[PDB]
Amino acid sequence: MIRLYPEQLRAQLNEGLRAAYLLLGNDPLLLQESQDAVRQVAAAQGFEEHHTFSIDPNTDWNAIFSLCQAMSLFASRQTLLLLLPENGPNAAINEQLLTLTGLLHDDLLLIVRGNKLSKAQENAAWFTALANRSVQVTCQTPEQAQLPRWVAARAKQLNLELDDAANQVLCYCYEGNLLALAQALERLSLLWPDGKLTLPRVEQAVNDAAHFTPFHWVDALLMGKSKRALHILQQLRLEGSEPVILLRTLQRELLLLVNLKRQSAHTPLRALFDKHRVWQNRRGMMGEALNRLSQTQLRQAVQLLTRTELTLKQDYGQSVWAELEGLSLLLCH
Amino acid sequence: MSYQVLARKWRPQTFADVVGQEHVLTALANGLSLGRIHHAYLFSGTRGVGKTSIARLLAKGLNCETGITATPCGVCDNCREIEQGRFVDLIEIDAASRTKVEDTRDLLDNVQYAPARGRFKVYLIDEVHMLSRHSFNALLKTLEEPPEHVKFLLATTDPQKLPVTILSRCLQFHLKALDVEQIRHQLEHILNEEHIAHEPRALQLLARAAEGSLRDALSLTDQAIASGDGQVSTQAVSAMLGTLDDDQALSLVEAMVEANGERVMALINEAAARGIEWEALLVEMLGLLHRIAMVQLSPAALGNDMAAIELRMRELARTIPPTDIQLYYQTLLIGRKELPYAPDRRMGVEMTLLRALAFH
Amino acid sequence: GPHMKFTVEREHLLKPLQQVSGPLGGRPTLPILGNLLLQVADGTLSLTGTDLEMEMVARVALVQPHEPGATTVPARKFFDICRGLPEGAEIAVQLEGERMLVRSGRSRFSLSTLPAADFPNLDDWQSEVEFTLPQATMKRLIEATQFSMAHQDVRYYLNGMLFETEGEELRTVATDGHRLAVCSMPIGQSLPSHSVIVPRKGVIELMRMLDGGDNPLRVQIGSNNIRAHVGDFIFTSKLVDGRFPDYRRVLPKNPDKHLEAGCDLLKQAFARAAILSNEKFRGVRLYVSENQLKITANNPEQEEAEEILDVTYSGAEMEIGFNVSYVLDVLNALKCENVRMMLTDSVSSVQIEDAASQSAAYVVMPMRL
Amino acid sequence: DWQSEVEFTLPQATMKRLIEATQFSMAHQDVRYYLNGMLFETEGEELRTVATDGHRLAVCSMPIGQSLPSHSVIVPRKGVIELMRMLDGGDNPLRVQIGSNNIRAHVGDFIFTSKLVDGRFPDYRRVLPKNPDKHLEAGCDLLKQAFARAAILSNEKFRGVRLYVSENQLKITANNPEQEEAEEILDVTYSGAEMEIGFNVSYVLDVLNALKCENVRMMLTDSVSSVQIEDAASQSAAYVVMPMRL
Ligand SMILES: Nc1ncnc2c1ncn2[C@@H]1O[C@H](COP(=O)(O)OP(=O)(O)O)[C@@H](O)[C@H]1O
Ligand code: BEF
Ligand SMILES: [Mg+2]
Ligand SMILES: [Zn+2]
Secondary structure: OOOHHHHHHHHHOOOOOOOOOEEEEOOOHHHHHHHHHHHHHHHHHOOOOEEEEEEOOOOOHHHHHHOOOOOOOOOOOOOEEEEEEOOOHHHHHHHHHHHHHHOOOOOEEEEEEEOOOOOOOOOOHHHHHHHOEEEEOOOOOOOOHHHHHHHHHHHHOOOOOEEEHHHHHHHOOOOOOOHHHHHHEEEEEEEOOOOEOOOHHHHHOOOOOOOOOHHHHHHHHHOHHHHHHHHHHHOOOOOOOOOHHHHHHHHHHHHHHHHHHHHHOOOHHHHHEEEEEHHHHHHHHHHHHHOOHHHHHHHHHHHHHHHHHHHOOOOOOOOOOHHEEEHHHHHOO | OOOOOOOOOOOOOOHHHHOOOOOHHHHHHHHHHHOOOOOOOEEOOOOOOHHHHHHHHHHHHHOOOOOOOOOOOOHHHHHHHHHEEEEEEOOEEHHHHOHHHHHHHHHHOOOOOOOOOOOOOOEEEEOOOHHHHHHHHHHHHHHHOOOEEEEEEEEEEOOOHHHHHHOOOEEEOOOOOOOOHHHHHHHHHHHHHHHOEHHHHHHEEEEEHHHHOOHHHHHHHHHHHHHHHHOOOOHHHHHHHOOOOOOOOHHHHHHHHOOHHHEEEEEEHHHHHOOOOHHHHHHHHHHHHHHHHHHHHOHHHHOOOOOOOHHHHHHHHHHHHHHHHHHHHHHHHHHHHOOOOOOOHHHHHHHHHHHHHHHO | OOEEEEEEHHHHHHHHHHOOOOOOOOOOOOHHHEEEEEEEOEEEEEEEEEEOEEEEEEEEOOOOOOOOEEEEEEEEHHHHHHHHHOOOOEEEEEOOOOEEEEEEOEEEEEOOOOOOHHHOOOOOOOOOEEEEEOOHHHHHHHHOOOOOOOOOOHHHHOOOEEEEEEEEEEEEEEEEEEEEEEEEEEEEEEEEEEEEOOOOOHHHHHHHHOOOOOOOOOOEOOOOOOEEEEEEEEEEEEEEEOOOOOOOHHHOOOOOOOOEEEEEHHHHHHHHHHOOOOOOOOOOEEEEOOOEEEEEEEOOOOOOEEEEOOOEOOOOOEEEEHHHHHHHHHHHHOOOOOOEEEEEOOOOOEEEEEEOOEHHHHHEOOOOO | OOOOOOOEEEEEEHHHHHHHHHOOOOOOOOHHHHHHHEEEEEEEEEEEEEEEEEEEEEEEEEEEEEEEEEEEEEEEEEHHHHHHHHHHOOOEEEEEEEEOEEEEEOOHHHHHEEEOOOOOOEEEEEHHHOOOOOEEEEEEEHHHHHHHHOOOOOOOOOOOEEEEEEEEEEOEOOOOOOOEEEEEOOOOOOOOOOOOEEOOHHHHHEEEEEOOOOOEEEEOOOOOEEEEEEEEOOOEEEEEEEOOOO
């Protein structure tokens, strides 16, 4: 179809609204902004009212299907917004979506919002049914590498001058929380109409609202950033994440890394990575970890992880975060 | 002879009487004066920081005959009816009381009906993070398109449990825990207006013991006045804070490191008078030593949990070689191992501290 | 002195207590909202019960000697004491300190009570609209326009009636998206222009509190609430916010091709169509021809039904497919003998009206073909 | 295989009355497993049904005209509830079979079978007060109405009334956790010392409900002993209510 990014949808929308729009991504802010832009353009082009339906195992598909053929007594045009579940569609929902796609017409600016679909969901009848003229917008969260560029670009968009230090601080405090990041940018613009947000001007108006997953901590350990790892642990603990899943992902990737380090003296790193099915984006990070980490450090990490799991699984679970921080520090030397 | 509680008698009535949170007050004033008020305001701070006070003041600004503004008036009808807690359409809800999706739905059936008085129908939900996920989703669904005169005010101590999607619907404010200076100045003003004799050192002790919360400072001030017959001297506050002291493990570590046997004995006897379990004391001593070792490894090992005693912890990390930390940790580990079979554990913990002091 | 003195037989107290017990649900939002407001004044007892959304008050004449006063008493308690007495019991309720003393022969109760002044604030109501109308018209309005009310809609304002109180013709309007119902009745006196949206919880109560009799229905309407008055019972309901789509703006003005048909025959035809109707979109199509109405019912299961109706028409050929429920309930509310209507092709509203009177009208839009 | 230790050929309405007299005063999932049931006792031409839970006792002793050896068995709560569920108000001659371990009932065209609780029921004779000197005789319906009136504001978690007995008037006083008071006065004929005695109004009301007579007599000893309730003109069934502490 037409696959675009949030910075391209604004230009695309002035070329004429399409039959359907699919907003795919894990970032709530990008999805919200793209949906708002689509709705504003639709209102400009004559779409007055809008209908919202969250897809649930108890979705009133008859109501929405009637809505496809529901005309407008006092209104003229109409949109139709669908909120996909966190796991995406299945057989029944995809069949319903195929029927809805068959029900599109001049009206029905069908809008689809949710998280990115998998390759299996990619190869589906409904997806191919609107595969000629629909517009798909990718709305994934920028990662650690591209976050400073993204926040600088948005600050330029919002007529705000930002420094490198302020960009780093905003990326640090609101990583994975770009909703709070945009709210912070708006707050800083409101508090200071000058727009020159120096480092002290942003240090006094931000709070540690960043959200992380266990994989973020695993990658921080592999890169060796002790401070980032400890920050991720603090954020995960304040969020209330169960330490067991952290220990599980740590165990899985640490066992894989121990196998790699053991086999390094036998087979080159490329073939070892290939055999163990290592993703390309993390091969350099894991090779750096293998180079930095010694066999003694790996044995000590395994020992500490085993002690931590034994402490947890014996129904005590007391001060497991201290042991996790100890392991994090140990793996970053 | 009223002698009412100083906590609520001194709740702020105008925005100029709120200590700290200056950026939040400026943002609220700017939204009330020139801009259009956002359809939902969420507040997140610490215990006794000002959240509900700020929300109530904002609701007072919303409903008033002078109009929607920052500093509306004094002693008006709506402002007084809010200050007395008797306002009709200023709904006050505890989220924990109505976590059920059915009760939440019943609460959200009231938004359609027009306000009885004023302009805006204001809902004030406390500890909003405790709402169930279904109730939270219903709240978001009613927040996306609220009525033109219906507004929501939400407060929570820990916003980390709130899903990120709440940021998509409401404008959030974070209130910074007050420092020693602001709390001390506000307590000084309160005591000066109430004609309470006091000393600056007593105020400093109260502020430091408050740990950032002004409600804690006011409660401690009330206790100090009650015990001291209004004469709030340094010695009175110091003694009554020592009665409430629970930093025994940290002081034990500090004194045992300094090879101060008499100090350790006095502190352990005080802990015995406190009726503290000895196994818990020893395990938290082990935790303190482990934290010292970790912050020695890297300055970032510390967090905000120990942000009350972080100064002494930094000094301990700076001054104590890691070998001494390892020796002390081993000594306390074997002491905890041998504690159950020892005599009455009040003396087993003592003798474990003895063994620790032997490494001098 | 400060002793609200009250004395009544239980027969004249049982029914009003049940009447004012409506809003009192399981858990009230406010604590005092779980109680009843009792006022003895001017030789009359007033019983008030509120839910912070609706209020019901019952007045009973008082002949026994009394002392004026007011107090808020527990709802279910007071009702339980009043009901549990033997038939013909003479209840004497007094106020001692902060306690209601309920005495009846040898039976004594001392209930705990809340101050009267703490019961919300049932004042500040300066109604700008005031009118009295016969019960028949009040019933007929909602008979005509209750079916077309939207329920459980994201748009709050579509969930309530609109009393258009302007000029002299009092109107009631209810639009559920495609469906629109309007009914106009002359009440007798002129009055300013107002558009008040009453919630479903208000009109559903109004229908239960309207009964045949000589009631004048002294209805008082303000800016945020509406109040109704029968001689002994009075009611209050708040109002739902939001604007309302102009019914008169979507009435067909220019087009004039008119269709005439009967009622009962259309009833039977549409009811037969509704029996095993379309599975998903239970709506059928019609082809309007000169003095002819062909109706076709199609189903996703290939099921087809065709019928021909002999009518009066003086227009062109049009094809229009609607939803059967909408026109069914429209005709059910109109309940006349013959229906005039208009319908044209493309996107245009289908209007249905009584061929004998123009006091009521309905608007329905077909679906895409 | 059945050895009928005790065989009754008895009218089904008779045992319907017997069980309905004592059904309510029964233990439900009580710690004392022997109380989770009802005692059938046989003494000559007399059939007795006893049921207690530690706070109530209900004994119904009715002649049957047929002489049988003395015996005592305990039938569980489920068995007697099933029997009542099946027992009707007809004329079918019911046939009870008592063995060592099981209870059986031939009832017209139906058969009811159950096991027996392995235990010894407490001696009800010593539970009855041994000095029933004070006597309150009053109309049953009046007492029922007064107790229901006093129990109107009584809570489920706090159900209890104090009886003040005086020369003639009987006062029933009820309080609640909400701290509101209810009082009823009756003109029961009595002659004795003033006294105050507290009982659960639910148990007393159930006792009165079990008595379908025009008036009843309550036998009282002192402020700390149990109270007996019986028909003022019949001795077929008696009830015991243990007082509550105040
Ligand atoms: N910024 C402030 N200004 C004035 N008083 C405050 C402030 N913060 C807290 N307080 C005092 O503490 C009491 C409770 O405050 P509250 O705002 O409820 O704290 P919380 O954030 O925990 O809900 C208030 O009555 C007030 O006396
Ligand atoms: F009311 Be606070 F959060 F202690
Ligand atoms: Mg609070
Ligand atoms: Zn004011």
